[PDB]
Amino acid sequence: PTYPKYLLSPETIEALRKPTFDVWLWEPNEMLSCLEHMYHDLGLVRDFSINPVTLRRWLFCVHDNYRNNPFHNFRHCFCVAQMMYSMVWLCSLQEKFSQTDILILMTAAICHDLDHPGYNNTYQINARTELAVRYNDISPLENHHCAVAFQILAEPECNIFSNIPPDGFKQIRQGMITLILATDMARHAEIMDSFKEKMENFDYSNEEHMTLLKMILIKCCDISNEVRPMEVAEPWVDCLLEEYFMQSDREKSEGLPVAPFMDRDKVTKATAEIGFIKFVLIPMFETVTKLFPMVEEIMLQPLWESRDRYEELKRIDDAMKELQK
Amino acid sequence: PTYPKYLLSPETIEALRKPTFDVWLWEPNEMLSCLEHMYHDLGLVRDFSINPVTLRRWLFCVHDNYRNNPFHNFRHCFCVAQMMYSMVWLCSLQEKFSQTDILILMTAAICHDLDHPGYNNTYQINARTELAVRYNDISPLENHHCAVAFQILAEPECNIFSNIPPDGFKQIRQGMITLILATDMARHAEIMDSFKEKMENFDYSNEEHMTLLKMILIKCCDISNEVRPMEVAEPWVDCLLEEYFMQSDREKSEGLPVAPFMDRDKVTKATAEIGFIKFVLIPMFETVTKLFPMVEEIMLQPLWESRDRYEELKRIDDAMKELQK
Ligand SMILES: CC(C)Cn1c(=O)n(C)c(=O)c2nc[nH]c21
Ligand SMILES: CC(C)Cn1c(=O)n(C)c(=O)c2nc[nH]c21
Ligand SMILES: [Mg+2]
Ligand SMILES: [Mg+2]
Ligand SMILES: [Zn+2]
Ligand SMILES: [Zn+2]
Known part of the structure; x- marks a missing residue:
């Protein structure tokens, strides 16, 4: 007939494999289904005996632990996981990695920003928050995402690793901790x-x-x-700046130092992306391309286009700014 | 946290394997999850490479194809599938049957009454309905259930058999047909x-x-x-008679022959079930017990209790009718 939303159509399941997937068209329950599909599709449910119902409960619990931040929320979570899933197909990662590595990459992608407060490590440290004190200024946010990840997995009802032998659990835990801590820019x-x-x-x-x-x-x-x-991509940048400005405003009316790249009076969306795309994004994907050549046409290309569009936007933007001077 | 209804709890999952499961406590949405669990749990999703998303669409299309009758409805469907699932465990059917047979049993059970009109074969034949004409008076209802089951399965989106070689399809199709046609009393x-x-x-x-x-x-x-x-069990009898009475009234009104066992003016829950239990149910389960002795304690026992309870209930009825004439 005309099936309900949470029942992904074959068209959606197909698109979920490409980085062109429109992450904005979906509601949480539909994204949860996509993530679920990923574990079955990659062979993780099969090779690790993940109880299918537990997989669902776990994803639901993970969703409940993401906060309603403009950027660091569950939809960003779904984006990272979906991009990782696309990488697996684009780069044929299952010919280079074991299923255990794949499980590690996927589960870490889904758990990497758990319970993010909306303020980065610099704010945590300068403001001497409880997280900065707990982790002694050592990547407090990422350490916290991990801890939450495993407190969640500690609950028997959400433990997708229940049927993995102890040696495997330890190996997976070590890998996840390493990846989640690596996300700290x-x-x-x-x-x-x-x-x-x-x-x-x-x-x-x-x-x-x-x-x-x-x-x-x-x-x-x-x-x-x-x-x-x-x-x-466009809307994500606005969400990020909303978060950054929130932090800079707070840091200003608290006497804490403010990073120029988060300063409302110094950063423009255009100048922000241009620099980030040319000095962080392109160089990174450039080196990755040396290992996986197909990555250039599927990901380096759209980054060049994005760089050029933002450089045009910067002209018009600076012009408008002159009229306001 | 607190998980939605469609995410079966481990308690439910454990009770789903026994004939004591209370089929009245759940809504279609929940029962569909149970059926889904059954396919994963019996290893059918695994051994036949059933795309888990397809399994859900298929179960949903099956549900939409059961009509809103007092007895022959989606819940009866669930009862049959859930009793089959219970028997697979009780009799350790996986020790005697191949996975192909288990698949045949479960799928036939879910589809055996698809699109039941609410009026039995005798009505179709006596009223010379399209069904009776289409099937030449040969088990028109059962032939129709089976045809609808494969109509649904022919829709790519619901084809849970999409990854089975054709020699396997033919073997499964023939078995389902045999089983569904065998349900004609x-x-x-x-x-x-x-x-x-x-x-x-x-x-x-x-x-x-x-x-x-x-x-x-x-x-x-x-x-x-x-x-x-x-x-x-008790409320099901009321649903059955409600359907039978609907038919006899209609037959009475269109001047078609009325079957005594469906006549309002002659049937009582007790008379209806006593004969059925004593001459149809008990004998059939007795033979199955010769092969699966554990069936006696789990299924004959309650049938014996139901037989006695209804027989005693009839005495109270006769004594009451006597006290009035
Ligand atoms: C400042 C930088 C470390 C953080 N950062 C980021 O994470 N994303 C995703 C961006 O698009 C971006 N643009 C500027 N900075 C960015
Ligand atoms: C005995 C038969 C002709 C009529 N019949 C039947 O088909 N089913 C399925 C029953 O449960 C039932 N109970 C009483 N009669 C029944
Ligand atoms: Mg992060
Ligand atoms: Mg029937
Ligand atoms: Zn992130
Ligand atoms: Zn039936």
Whole structure:
């Protein structure tokens, strides 16, 4: 007949594999179904004996632990997971990685921003919040996302790892913690340098090389909005700035230092993306392309287009600003 | 947190395997989840590469195709499938039958009464309905249920058999057809005799022996209401008579022959069930017990109790009618 929303149509299930997927057309229950589909489709439910009902409860519990922030919310979560899922197909990751690595990449993508408060690590540290005190200024937000991830998995009803032997659990936990902690942008240059070093002679059988590759993969998915079609990416930037401005305003009326890139009076959407696309995004996907050449046409290309559109927007933007001076 | 109804709790999942399960407590939405669980739990999704999303669409289309009758409705459907699922565990059917047969039993059980009009074969034939004309008076209802089942399965979006080689399809289709056509009560005596004849020296290796057993199994499940706990079974009789009375009244009004067992002026819940339990139900389950002794304690016991409870109830009825004339 005419099936209900939570029942993904074959058209949707097909599109879910490409980075062109419109993440905005869906409501939470439909996104939860997409994530569910991903675990069955990638063979994770099968190879790890994940109880299908538990998988659902777990996703629902994960959803309940994401906050209603303009950016760091459940829909961003779904974006990272969906981009990771696309990466698996685009790069044929299942010929390079074991199912355990895939489970690690996917579960970490879904759990990487759990219970994000809407204010970054710099604010946590400068404001001496309880999280900064708890984690001693060492990537407090990411450490917290992990802890929540495993407190959730500790609940028997949500433990998608119930049937994995203990050695496997430990191996998965270690991998997830490493990936989630790697998303902290403060460590971006460090992680990039290490990867590029290993990239001089990449060894798919070297465990230390794969760890760095997985860290890069989840980092790519975490800040991959600009790779998506313009109509899908555009709104995310506004959501991010809304969050950044909120923090800068708070930092100003609290006497805490304010980062220029979050300063309402110094940053423009255009100048912001241009620099981020040319000095963070493109260089990263550029090195990843050396390993997976198909990545250039599917992701480096839309980044070049995005860079050019924002450079045009910057002209008009600066013009408008002159009239207001 | 607190999970929605469509996410079965582990308590429900555990009770779903026994004939004591209370079929009246759930709404279609919930029952559909149960059926879905059954396919994953029996390993049918796994062994036949059923796309889990397709499984959901298929179950939804099946639900939409059951009519809103007092008895032959989606809930009866669920009862039959749930009783079949209970028997797979109780009798350890997975030790005697291949996965292909289990799939045949479960799917036939879910589809056996699809699009039931609410008036039995005798009515279709006597009123010379389109169905009776289409099927040449040969089990018109059963032929129609089966045709609708494969109509649904022919819709790509609902084709839970999409990943089975054609030789497998043919084997599954033929089995379902045999089973669904076997549910026509007009053939009860015939089927029972053949089964008993083979029962003289049952051979789990003889395919003709196994075909009869599967026929008896689905026949048992189809009319297994009285096997359920008194409070779960009682309301079903009212639904049945409500349908029978609707037909006899109509037959009376159109001047068509009326069957005594459906006549308001002659049937009482007690008279209806006593004979049915004593001469149809008990004998059939007695034969099945010769192969699965555990059936006696789990199913004959409650049938005996229902027989006695209804017989005693009739005495109270006769004594009451006496006290009035
Ligand atoms: C400032 C930077 C570390 C954070 N950051 C980010 O995460 N995304 C996704 C952007 O699009 C972006 N644009 C500027 N900065 C950005
Ligand atoms: C005995 C038969 C002719 C009529 N019949 C029947 O078909 N089913 C399924 C019943 O449950 C039933 N109960 C009484 N009569 C019944
Ligand atoms: Mg983050
Ligand atoms: Mg029937
Ligand atoms: Zn993130
Ligand atoms: Zn029936």
